[PDB]
Design a binder for this molecule. Structure first.
Ligand SMILES: CC(C)=CCSP(=O)(O)OP(=O)(O)O
Ligand SMILES: [Mg+2]
Ligand SMILES: [Mg+2]
Ligand SMILES: [Mg+2]
Ligand SMILES: [Mg+2]
Ligand SMILES: [Mg+2]
Ligand SMILES: [Mg+2]
Ligand SMILES: [Mg+2]
Ligand SMILES: [Mg+2]
Length: 306
RNA sequence: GCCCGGAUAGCUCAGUCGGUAGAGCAGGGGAUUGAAAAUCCCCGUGUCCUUGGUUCGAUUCCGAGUCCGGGCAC
């Protein structure tokens, strides 16, 4: 029953700022919960904390992967669980910060044990999609696993592929394996979420931030990655907001102004979904991004003196 | 100044053989089990620029005006 804290929220909501200020009055250790902040070489477009901030409040799970190697909610849970052990062992409290809700979820509720990605069976699945389309595959999932087929739309290639893969590797069906639940988070968690008071203020912060990045050398950053010649748009790292658009720009597929428009929109759409996650998330205490930055107090009281 | 194209949803544009119109994108909402900053599902009434003409009826054809891209001329 050790204690732990979750500081969630959408992009540009001031989560990072709040976390280090918290480090000041609480015996907490910061753990990053961000699918993009894991990449080495992706610092400005991901809004990664700078070296000074990191000096004040160290973050675990940052720069732990090369943009060419995919991560997963499963890998995060493992790494996260291990980092928490180490932290609580030191008599301090784990403060998980980020905007990647699926990771928070996988960590909190666990994950049904399932086979990991198998590049070979995926390549085959992709192959059959090009020849017969994803419909042929969805009709096949329909035969072996109807429960999953009803949930997964025939237009959802990632989930469709995933449901077939599990079956092709184990022979066991996805709905059958998911009947076994994953290990819940053996911690007492206090979940907070911070966001601006209105959707429009969020949009302004998003657009403004995107320009601060361009002005901080974002383009050059993405070019360094473009120059490696080994990264492609089917990699989680390149599909990240901002990066994907900038990649289209370096490929000469779109103009600069077009890239800036799409990156901003892409970031707003991301925020929209993040808010969808938080809405209905159980046990969430809401805090305000805007000036009520002194929301640390609401944290101080909910978690109480430790 | 003259000629040729545009002018229709927040933006880019389709369309209406004359019977008041629809895609994409933007935006909104919802899903979410080893790619998740990903992948996918649902939501489209707008003085069809203005004004005359013809017409039962015009955003739609014709005339003129206005604004916007070009071209010719100085
Ligand atoms: C989505 C983009 C472009 C950057 C990541 S932003 P973030 O989640 O770090 O936002 P805050 O930490 O809340 O400022
Ligand atoms: Mg941050
Ligand atoms: Mg227009
Ligand atoms: Mg037209
Ligand atoms: Mg008709
Ligand atoms: Mg309509
Ligand atoms: Mg949209
Ligand atoms: Mg008329
Ligand atoms: Mg007319």
């Amino acid at each position: 029953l050790p204690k732990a804290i979750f500081l969630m929220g959408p992009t540009a909501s001031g989560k990072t700022a709040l976390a280090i200020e918290l480090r000041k009055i609480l015996p907490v250790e910061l753990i990053s919960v961000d699918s993009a902040l894991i990449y080495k070489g992706m610092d400005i477009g991901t809004a990664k904390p700078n070296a000074e901030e990191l000096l004040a409040a160290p973050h675990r799970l940052l720069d732990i992967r090369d943009p060419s190697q995919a991560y997963s909610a499963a890998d995060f849970r493992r790494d996260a669980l291990a980092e928490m052990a180490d932290i609580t062992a030191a008599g301090r409290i784990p403060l998980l910060v980020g905007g990647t809700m699926l990771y928070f979820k996988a960590l909190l509720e666990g994950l049904s044990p399932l086979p990991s990605a198998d590049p070979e069976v995926r390549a085959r699945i992709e192959q059959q999609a090009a020849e017969q389309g994803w419909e042929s595959l969805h009709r096949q999932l329909q035969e072996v696993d109807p429960v999953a087929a009803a949930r997964i739309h025939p237009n959802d290639p990632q989930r469709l592929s995933r449901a077939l893969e599990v079956f092709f590797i184990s022979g066991k069906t996805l709905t059958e394996l998911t009947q076994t639940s994953g290990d819940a988070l053996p911690y007492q968690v206090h979940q907070f979420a911070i966001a601006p008071a209105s959707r429009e203020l969020l949009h302004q912060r998003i657009e403004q931030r995107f320009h601060q990045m361009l002005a901080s050398g974002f383009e050059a950053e993405v070019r360094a990655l473009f120059a490696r010649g080994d990264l492609h748009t089917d990699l989680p790292s390149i599909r990240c907001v901002g990066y994907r658009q900038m990649w289209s720009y370096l490929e000469g597929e779109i103009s600069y102004d077009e890239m800036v428009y799409r990156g901003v929109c892409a970031t707003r759409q991301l925020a929209k979904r993040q808010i969808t996650w938080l809405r209905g998330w159980e046990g969430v205490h809401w805090l305000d991004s805007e000036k009520p930055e002194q929301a640390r107090d609401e944290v101080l009281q909910v978690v109480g003196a430790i």
